[PDB]
Amino acid sequence: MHLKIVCLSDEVREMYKNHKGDSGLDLFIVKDEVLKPKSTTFVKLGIKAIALQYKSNYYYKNIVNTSFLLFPRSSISKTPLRLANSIGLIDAGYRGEIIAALDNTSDQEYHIKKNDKLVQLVSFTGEPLSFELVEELDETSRGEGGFGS
Amino acid sequence: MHLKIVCLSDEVREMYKNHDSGLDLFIVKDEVLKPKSTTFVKLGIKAIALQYKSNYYYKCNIVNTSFLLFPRSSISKTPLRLANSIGLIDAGYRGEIIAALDNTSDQEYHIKKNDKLVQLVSFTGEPLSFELVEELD
Amino acid sequence: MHLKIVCLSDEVREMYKNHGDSGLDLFIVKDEVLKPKSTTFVKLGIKAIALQYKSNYYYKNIVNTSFLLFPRSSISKTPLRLANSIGLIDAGYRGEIIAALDNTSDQEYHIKKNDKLVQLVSFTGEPLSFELVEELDETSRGEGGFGS
């Protein structure tokens, strides 16, 4: 599966230019942030993305945009943070910012830091993922494309 | 993927008659979830999923396939969490679909008929269609 | 999908000798106390590689494939929850399979040998078969090769 990723700021672009055949692509926490105790926080990941796969014939009564998945990384387990919706389902048509809904199960504030990696993108196929950085997902303004400001 | 869905009552039938990689399922009756609890919430439907037959590696045309029960992203706005993370409905399962919901709150939580907290999903992530049937077979 | 499983002890081997579904249940292999309000990396005493028919995939005969670790539905009646929601095991991973279990209770939780709390699942949702092997490959991490 191939991901076209739009970085929503230059700071985020630099992180993905220096990204430090896996079935999961790690996403960065892009800003230092304090998560309140016993709370759910909708953490903005500073990116938009579309996923591309080979077209396949499916029962329903060359390359296509596909739905994809937002998994916790296994290393999330050592923290008190849990993905509220278990596994995120990103539909083929979504053009908004990718967000991780994080439950802080601790009674203390939790500090996430720029460069932390708590979540990853995954294909329904489970195949290796490649990605590229693009300026827009499509022609629409929500896709960051098209004429004008 | 195409689903054949048996609604276990006419009240449920009506909801789905008047109903994307995920097919939203309805909460079918008003219910109180106790604080700090897990409740097996009955969704009032039975279902089988149909896909094209595939060659798969295994050591000893349309087929029924296993499918998945996901939380809806909007569940995050509630204190409810799916206890088993993602439900796996085996190809051979004929019973009612249940959502095992944890109430993470220290107070009771009220779910309402017509609430949409969970969704069915194919292993392929392909769009879903459904029809209502009287029997699964 | 077909799994080649290395059992890390004879005790575990005996469990899997005496074990069609989309999920292959894995055993808890040792009695263990999970502390209240904790996350415990529970060692499952196995290593495993998954095999599927090769498929063409967009990226810019049988092969090693990635697979998934799901909670079993019966975990729901316990206070135990899978910390990382669903586990992702990358193609060819050679480490011991671990279940990171949150004990959400304020009491210690006793897991028992023979308990079944998690299962392996294919990305295709196809039936799983398995065989017991002594190594995954020639590497020490695969439990194979010379020595020592």
Ligand SMILES: CN(C[C@H]1O[C@@H](n2ccc(=O)[nH]c2=O)C[C@@H]1O)C(c1ccccc1)c1ccccc1
């Ligand atoms: C509105 N999103 C859902 C969208 O996000 C996309 N989406 C879906 C799943 C996911 O894990 N991440 C994500 O960005 C597609 C969905 O259409 C709300 C939201 C809810 C749960 C997780 C993440 C976001 C939301 C709620 C409150 C504040 C901000 C965002």
Ligand SMILES: CN(C[C@H]1O[C@@H](n2ccc(=O)[nH]c2=O)C[C@@H]1O)C(c1ccccc1)c1ccccc1
């Ligand atoms: C018996 N189901 C498991 C089946 O339900 C099907 N199943 C599986 C996963 C799921 O999320 N939902 C579901 O309906 C296929 C599984 O084979 C018990 C059950 C336990 C936990 C969650 C959901 C159901 C159960 C036990 C006692 C009372 C009611 C339900």
Ligand SMILES: CN(C[C@H]1O[C@@H](n2ccc(=O)[nH]c2=O)C[C@@H]1O)C(c1ccccc1)c1ccccc1
């Ligand atoms: C190193 N694993 C991650 C790998 O485990 C494999 N892995 C992945 C997901 C999973 O649920 N179980 C598992 O064994 C493939 C992943 O690449 C660490 C780990 C962290 C949390 C849960 C499970 C494992 C780990 C860290 C420290 C001590 C023991 C285990």
